[PDB]
Design a protein around this ligand. Structure first.
Ligand SMILES: COc1cc(C(=O)N2CC[C@@H](O)[C@@H](N)C2)cc2nc(-c3cc4cccnc4n3CC3CC3)n(C)c12
Ligand SMILES: Cc1c(C)n(-c2ccc(Br)cc2)c2ncnc(N3CCC([C@H](N)C(=O)N4CCCC4)CC3)c12
Length: 596
């Protein structure tokens, strides 16, 4: 591929000297100084110059496209030369001379997103970032750490400069690298000392431009580029580094640009993993440890020992994938500073990869909790958080209805589990209806005397539970709330009913008619592949086995999932907590092949 370049005005009065950068098309201006007694002209040049005439004799028409290209870089100032002869009907040929110096200036980065640095002449448009498997544009990682060995540069992105210039070339020219003032505080560029040093920063905050010290001849030099900021409401995520060839041969007059070239980087966004992604490591923080260590063993997963205050995502580039931990206080780590109840990672779930009326979301979609309309007594997730998730684009957030809950988190009535059929997964929704249907079937058999809350200090019987008309209307209202979100999830994730499974769950209203788990919230389980760690419901025991555990096994076990009910899954801080996170394998799908 070849891009446009410079215009050269030739004149028969004085000879003309010019630089040409291999890879650019140079047009020629012949008429602006052509003699008046002349009607035609001819072209003759050095074997290294390629001439091209559009629209070997040619007339002096103003609209003739004369263009030159260079076969190879010069060895001396003025290697290749071009000679314009102007002749006429009775005029001896009048020559105009042009001394050209060819020079290679290739600024290469991993434009093709293949993990190999390719030159800008291998892409049509280098000054543009295009999504998708056919697009162009390199990728940067954010520095997430609160002399430089090779180990520090393994995260950074390579950018090379290849020059091939006459020996004396940078006596009269200089090359400068620069970043736009507005993007400078979001990047940092290191110059490879060949291996770099902590004081080799050429570009970065408070330093937008830098004069390269390049010697004549054939020379290649390496740069390492890290990014300093994720995409955000005020940062779309693009950083364009440009290199400019300046002409400094006149000492009195300012520098003159003869050439620019640029590469465009996109900062890789922060990406979250749905419960369908295979687990790599379980972090936990007391007899429930044995139940989760068994789980971890059976699912062939690692278990380290020591919550909803942090979330473990990743950032990905063709050369590296690093997992980044986000923490909202109240390798790779990032924090946030101010505070509403819905500003918790507990209010942040991720669908599995999905396709919605044509549009494909191969990294899933982020679900977060919200009110249904803004009221004086309504909570919402802080705007700055909503926007930051939207700014990473690749997991197009979806606004659900969770304000009806006392704490307000979607993960209280929502969860996904892997499945071996249909779209490969299943939606789990808490369901008061499914619980009431089960408890009535148990009363229809004479077991209404069975007691819930068995194993704990006060219990209750199925008879008194099933007949409480105050509680029935509570769960009828809750059932409406969850149903709203159900029609929303069917629309934005494009689900059929056959993709949704109702886990029986009872609720109770508390302060301000806000909802809360009646018994331990079993939809909020611990998904580790085909092995589920479910909160022990302590339901009524019929035939020595909990009848609630019986239902959930009858629902999940046919998917191939191994149900293990954990006794002390949640802990009360005289607030409700669970001490478990899960790092999961990042998506095999490369986020840059998406088209948001
Ligand atoms: C708001 O109340 C809750 C939230 C969540 C949840 O899913 N959570 C936790 C909060 C946030 O972190 C969410 N993101 C995730 C789970 C809950 N289970 C119960 C529960 C009910 C029950 C009945 C008898 C004995 N024990 C019982 N328990 C368990 C015991 C702590 C009290 N309650 C009351 C829960
Ligand atoms: C950190 C963070 C978090 C946990 N959350 C969040 C999201 C969802 C929930 Br639920 C709870 C919290 C944010 N939301 C909105 N802005 C956030 N910042 C992202 C970082 C950005 C900073 N300049 C940067 O890029 N750095 C700093 C170190 C190197 C890279 C500034 C804005 C965050």
């Amino acid at each position: 591929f070849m891009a446009q370049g410079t215009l050269i005005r030739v004149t028969p009065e004085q000879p003309t000297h010019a630089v040409c950068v291999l890879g650019t098309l140079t047009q020629l201006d012949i008429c602006s100084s052509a003699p008046e007694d002349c009607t035609s002209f001819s072209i003759n040049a050095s074997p290294g110059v390629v001439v091209d005439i559009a629209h070997s004799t040619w007339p002096l028409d103003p609209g003739v496209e004369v263009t030159l290209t260079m076969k190879a870089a010069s060895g001396s100032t003025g290697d290749q030369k071009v000679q314009i002869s102007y002749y006429g009907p009775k005029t001896p040929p009048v020559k105009a001379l042009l001394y050209l110096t060819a020079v290679e200036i290739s600024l290469c980065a991993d434009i093709t997103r293949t993990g190999k640095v390719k030159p800008t002449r291998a892409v049509k448009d280098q000054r543009t970032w295009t999504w998708g498997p056919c697009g162009q544009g390199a990728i940067l990682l954010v520095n997430c750490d609160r002399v430089l060995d090779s180990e520090d540069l393994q995260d950074m992105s390579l950018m090379t400069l290849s020059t091939k210039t006459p020996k004396d070339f940078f006596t009269n020219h200089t090359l400068v690298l620069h970043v736009a003032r507005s993007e400078m505080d979001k990047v940092r560029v290191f110059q490879a000392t060949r291996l770099s040093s902590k004081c080799s920063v050429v570009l970065g905050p408070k330093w937008p431009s830098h004069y390269l010290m390049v010697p004549g001849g054939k020379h290649n030099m390496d740069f390492y580029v890290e990014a300093l900021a994720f995409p955000d409401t005020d940062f779309p995520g693009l950083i364009t580094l440009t290199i400019s060839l300046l002409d400094t041969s006149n000492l009195e007059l300012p520098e003159a640009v003869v050439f620019q070239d640029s590469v465009v980087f996109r900062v890789a966004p922060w990406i979250m993993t749905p419960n369908t992604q295979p687990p790599q490591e379980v972090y936990a923080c007391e007899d429930f440890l044995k139940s989760v260590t068994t789980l971890a063993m059976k699912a062939k997963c690692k278990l380290t020992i020591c919550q909803d205050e942090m979330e473990i995502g990743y950032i990905q580039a063709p050369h590296k994938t690093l997992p980044v931990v986000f923490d909202s206080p109240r390798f790779g780590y990032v924090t946030r500073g101010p505070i509403s109840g819905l500003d918790s990672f507990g209010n942040l779930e991720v669908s599995p990869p999905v396709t919605v009326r044509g549009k494909e979301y191969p990294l899933g979609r982020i679900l977060f909790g919200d009110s249904c309309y803004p009221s004086n007594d309504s909570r919402q997730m802080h705007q700055a958080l909503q926007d930051f998730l939207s700014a990473q684009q690749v997991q197009a957030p979806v606004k659900l209805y969770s304000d009806w809950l006392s704490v307000g988190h979607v993960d209280e009535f929502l969860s996904f589990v892997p499945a071996p059929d249909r779209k490969g997964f299943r939606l789990l929704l808490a369901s008061p209806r499914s619980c009431y249907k089960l408890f009535q079937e148990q009363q229809n058999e004479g077991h209404g005397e069975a007691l819930l809350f068995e194993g704990i200090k006060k219990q209750q019987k199925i008879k008194n539970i099933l007949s409480n008309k105050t509680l029935r209307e509570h769960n009828s209202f809750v059932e409406r709330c969850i149903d709203w979100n159900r029609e929303l999830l069917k629309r934005e994730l494009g689900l059929a009913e056959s993709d949704i499974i109702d886990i029986p769950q009872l609720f109770k209203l508390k302060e301000f008619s806000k909802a809360e788990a009646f018994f331990p919230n079993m939809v909020n389980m611990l998904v580790l592949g085909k092995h589920l760690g479910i909160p022990k419901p302590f339901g009524p025991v019929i035939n020595g086995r909990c009848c609630l555990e019986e239902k959930v096994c009858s629902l999940l076990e046919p998917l191939g999932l191994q149900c293990t009910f954990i006794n002390d899954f949640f802990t009360y801080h005289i607030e409700v907590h669970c001490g478990t996170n899960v790092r999961r394998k990042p998506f095999s799908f490369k986020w840059w092949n998406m088209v948001p």
